[PDB]
Amino acid sequence: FACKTANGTAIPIGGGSANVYVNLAPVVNVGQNLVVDLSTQIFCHNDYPETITDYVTLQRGSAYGGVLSNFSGTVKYSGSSYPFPTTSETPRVVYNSRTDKPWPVALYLTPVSSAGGVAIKAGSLIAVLILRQTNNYNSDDFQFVWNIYANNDVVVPT
Numbered sequence: 001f002a003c004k005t006a007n008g009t010a011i012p013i014g015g016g017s018a019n020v021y022v023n024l025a026p027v028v029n030v031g032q033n034l035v036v037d038l039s040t041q042i043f044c045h046n047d048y049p050e051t052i053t054d055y056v057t058l059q060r061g062s063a064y065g066g067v068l069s070n071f072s073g074t075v076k077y078s079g080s081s082y083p084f085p086t087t088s089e090t091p092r093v094v095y096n097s098r099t100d101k102p103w104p105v106a107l108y109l110t111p112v113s114s115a116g117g118v119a120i121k122a123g124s125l126i127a128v129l130i131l132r133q134t135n136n137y138n139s140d141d142f143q144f145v146w147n148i149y150a151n152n153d154v155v156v157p158t
């Protein structure tokens, strides 16, 4: 079991960390959503499904810099939403195949009314999300730590 970003950053078997750079809508209005759909950028696969079945949770998610201070919101993980920053490990997702399969985590962030100026600086860390992979076969428990960075800039217009 390993994972890769869209543009080819790779976290190997056993876990590790990676940076993932994402494009954001340039304007979000107070009352509207800024979506971060990592399921278009983070992909995983079972490396021997013949015998093994891999289980994947979002162990933990945390907000940094801009999103940490001008935004509230949730994280949708497999059809269901949860508070973000996270308060609890999410349910398991089953990684079936040797075929690359999206990590289906997306953030929905709304700006607080005091969000004025540039809410998120470009090139800043906005989120860290810890992918935790166990299985049905041995005692393996590995964290795949993704550091989410912003490409462009987002402003919230007064």
Ligand SMILES: Cc1nc(-c2cnccn2)sc1C(=O)c1cnc(N[C@H]2O[C@H](CO)[C@@H](O)[C@H](O)[C@@H]2O)s1
Pocket: 001, 002, 013, 014, 045, 046, 047, 048, 049, 051, 052, 053, 054, 134, 135, 140
């Ligand atoms: C499980 C297994 N049986 C093999 C076999 C069976 N019969 C005759 C010859 N050989 S080879 C064989 C194997 O190749 C393995 C392939 N990956 C293995 N472990 C890694 O991948 C698993 C599946 O994604 C993860 O759940 C685990 O955490 C770790 O990352 S063991």
Ligand code: NI
Pocket: 001, 002, 045, 047
């Ligand atoms: Ni592989």
